[PDB]
């Protein structure tokens, strides 16, 4: 019973890796050998955001590149302005432990997560003037890890019990749920077209999920340890992944295998959160040894090093117009970095 | 340019009222001391939360000792894979670990407890955090030794070749065998804590009861020891 099944599974995975090896006509870095190198790229701390009490776990930019949400471990979710360093809202959370925050594209809502498996959405209309909890979603068993808005009607969430659902806020139920993972799903990265997203679990397998169909299309197993964070390319035809084996990886949806591997001998520390730039040429990496490494996505070479943090670079964000890059660490200092 | 500077005015007034509320919550959050409560499912850590008092993922307990506020965070309906969310609790003041002892039982739980303590201890982000130890079910250890056979000596060949330490003082009305068992468990967990030898954090061992009132005062005393040792480190005295 189980053994013939697992043998057929192994022959299928041999078929898939025959496919993958047939497809591999050449490598991308041989292709990129007659390409102008970017060179040393310096970025400086234009602003420092302060007034956070505990460590800053996750943060998310707005679509007008003006207001950022920052999520902290003191129970304070702060809506910031990046230009004038003004806290344009400060929101007190029920649970003190937070692992994610999302900011809506219209800016009407902020969503917050944590260890109490409840995704809490806050409205920002403020007709009375006091921010209030607009709704609490509770349908996950594992801890809520990273949750991301498609629009103001549908929020997609990543639990800790290897499940990812698609929530409707109006019904307050789960529209579709899928459990295709074997390890703990850390974070998901939505598409710019929002028809697909990619999730990074802890079984070293990145998954490509159709939102409307409700099942995976592709499985990627090129890593060696836990996939911490995942980020889509700006065209939506590729993604990047960061792991704990100190290697960043770039993946293709069409080739169905890894294009490039980003690895340096001197740094063996883990890779927290990775965000592309607007053009896609710089991959930006939040390492665990207190700095951000600016990889060249086509040449696999460190442009430049953002060693302005005292503690580990917990998460890394990039505006939609590519203007500045905001990094949140565990020393409660959020840096806005500009080239 | 009048409306613009008025909007800047409005943002400045709201930033003032926010940074007031921030400073008040900074006061109240430096008042607060945070205690992560970790124990296995065989161990009666529901009994220890019932003591501490007298569907969600995390359960939170607030109690105050000598006008000093404590929050104890009890892991609840969570998954067995515990490493990805153990990173959160480096910011807490101290981590209370409660382990059962059954020596009369499907598998060895003592070894699992030792392995979990070792993984807590040698973890990178959990180096700066102190761990406070409760060895539960001592009465049951007493009652179960007199069964004609001993589990621990089977599971541990070192316990045949072991003698009770002379500096430690057993309580009266106790069997020298049962106290040998107690002290040898305590020695196992302290050899695991002394193995690393970092000197940033220590392991505070306690022998408790099924029904006991004194636990809140022991956690208060070990808190006072942890912040005294932190100040001794901090001024480079030790």
């Amino acid at each position, epitope marked *: 019973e189980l053994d013939q099944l697992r043998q057929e599974a192994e022959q299928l995975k041999n078929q898939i890796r025959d496919a993958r090896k047939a497809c591999a006509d050449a490598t991308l870095s041989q292709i990129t050998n007659n390409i102008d190198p970017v060179g040393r790229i310096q970025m400086r701390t234009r602003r420092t955001l302060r007034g956070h009490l505990a460590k800053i776990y996750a943060m998310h930019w707005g679509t007008d590149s003006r207001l950022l949400v920052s999520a902290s471990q003191d129970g304070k979710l702060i809506i910031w302005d990046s230009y004038t360093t003004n806290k344009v809202h400060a929101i007190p959370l029920r649970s003190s432990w937070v692992m994610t925050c999302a900011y809506a594209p219209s800016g009407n809502y902020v969503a917050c997560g944590g260890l109490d498996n409840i995704c809490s959405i806050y409205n920002l209309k403020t007709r009375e003037g006091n921010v209030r909890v607009s709704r609490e979603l509770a349908g996950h068993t594992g801890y809520l890890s990273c949750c991301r808005f498609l629009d103001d009607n549908q929020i997609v969430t990543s639990s800790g019990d290897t499940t990812c659902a698609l929530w409707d806020i109006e019904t307050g139920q789960q529209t579709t749920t899928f459990t295709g993972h074997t390890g703990d799903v850390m974070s998901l990265s939505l598409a710019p077209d929002t028809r697909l997203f990619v999730s990074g679990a802890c079984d070293a397998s990145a998954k490509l999920w159709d939102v409307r169909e409700g099942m995976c299309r592709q499985t990627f197993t090129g890593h060696e340890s836990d996939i911490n964070a995942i980020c889509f390319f700006p065209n939506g035809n590729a993604f990047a992944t960061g792991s704990d084996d*100190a290697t960043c990886r770039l993946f293709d949806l069409r080739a169905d295998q890894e294009l490039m591997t980003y690895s340096h001998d001197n740094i063996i520390c883990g890779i927290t959160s990775v965000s592309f730039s607007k053009s896609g040429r710089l991959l930006l990496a939040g390492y665990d040894d207190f700095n951000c490494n600016v990889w060249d996505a086509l040449k696999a070479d460190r442009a430049g090093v953002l060693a302005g943090h005292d503690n580990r670079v917990s998460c890394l964000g990039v505006t939609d117009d590519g203007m500045a890059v905001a990094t949140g660490s565990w020393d409660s200092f959020l840096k806005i970095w500009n080239g | 340019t009048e409306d613009q500077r008025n909007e800047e005015k409005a943002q400045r007034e709201a930033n003032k009222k926010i940074e007031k509320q921030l400073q008040k919550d900074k006061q109240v959050y430096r008042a607060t001391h945070r205690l992560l409560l970790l124990g296995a499912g065989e161990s009666g850590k529901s009994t220890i939360v019932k003591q501490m008092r007298i569907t969600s993922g995390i359960f939170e307990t607030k109690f105050q000792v000598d006008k000093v506020n404590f929050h104890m965070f009890d892991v609840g309906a969570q998954r067995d894979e515990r490493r990805k969310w153990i990173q959160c609790f480096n910011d807490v003041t101290a981590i209370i670990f409660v382990v059962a002892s059954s020596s009369y039982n499907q598998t060895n739980r003592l070894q699992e407890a030792l392995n979990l303590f070792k993984s807590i201890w040698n973890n990178r982000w959990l180096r700066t955090i102190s761990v406070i130890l409760f060895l539960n079910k001592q009465d049951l250890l007493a009652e179960k030794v007199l069964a004609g056979k001993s589990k621990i000596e089977d599971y541990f060949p070192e316990f045949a070749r072991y003698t009770t330490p002379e500096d430690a003082t057993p309580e009266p009305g106790e069997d020298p065998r049962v106290t040998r068992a107690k002290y040898f468990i305590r020695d196992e967990f302290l050899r695991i804590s002394t193995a690393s030898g970092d000197g940033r954090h220590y392991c505070y061992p306690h022998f408790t009861c099924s029904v006991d009132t004194e636990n809140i005062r022991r956690v208060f005393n070990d808190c006072r020891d942890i912040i005294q040792r932190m100040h001794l480190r901090q001024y480079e005295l030790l």
Partner: nanobody, 128 residues
Framework: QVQLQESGGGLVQPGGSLRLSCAAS????????MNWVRQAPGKGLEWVSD????????SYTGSVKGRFTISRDNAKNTLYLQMNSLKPEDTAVYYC?????????????????????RGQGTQVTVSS
């Protein structure tokens, strides 16, 4: 792809000798602390034993201590377990495991709800 293939085992006699092998494919072998873990019928997983990157430090579980040899070759990329003096009370599935992070001393691989860095494991039966 992290993949683990255990090898040897089967129906044996008490007091005999048996080798287990673990072929560790799909990663760099020297970076990771690696371990053996076994599973009794109708019982839970229990940590047999452990081995670091260089292989200098080795500990065991007491109840079977001194009875098993854990050799990792870095070159051959295999992990061999040497058994002798077999006891009937210890008849179990056996599983080769890897700790998930490189260059670290901590491990969290006791979870039985589909831990994904272990092999399929081998049945090892003692009949007296």
């Amino acid at each position: 792809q992290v993949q683990l293939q255990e090898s040897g085992g089967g129906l044996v006699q008490p007091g005999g000798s048996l080798r287990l092998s673990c072929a560790a494919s799909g990663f760099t072998f020297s970076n990771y602390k690696m371990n053996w873990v076994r599973q009794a019928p109708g019982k839970g997983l229990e940590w047999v034993s452990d081995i670091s990157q260089s292989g200098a430090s080795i500990s065991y579980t007491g109840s079977v201590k001194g009875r098993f040899t854990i050799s990792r070759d870095n070159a051959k990329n295999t992990l061999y377990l040497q058994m002798n003096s077999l006891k009937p009370e210890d008849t179990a599935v056996y599983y080769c495991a890897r700790c998930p992070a490189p260059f670290t001393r901590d491990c969290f691989d006791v979870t039985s709800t589909t831990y994904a860095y272990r092999g399929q494991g081998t049945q090892v039966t003692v009949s007296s």
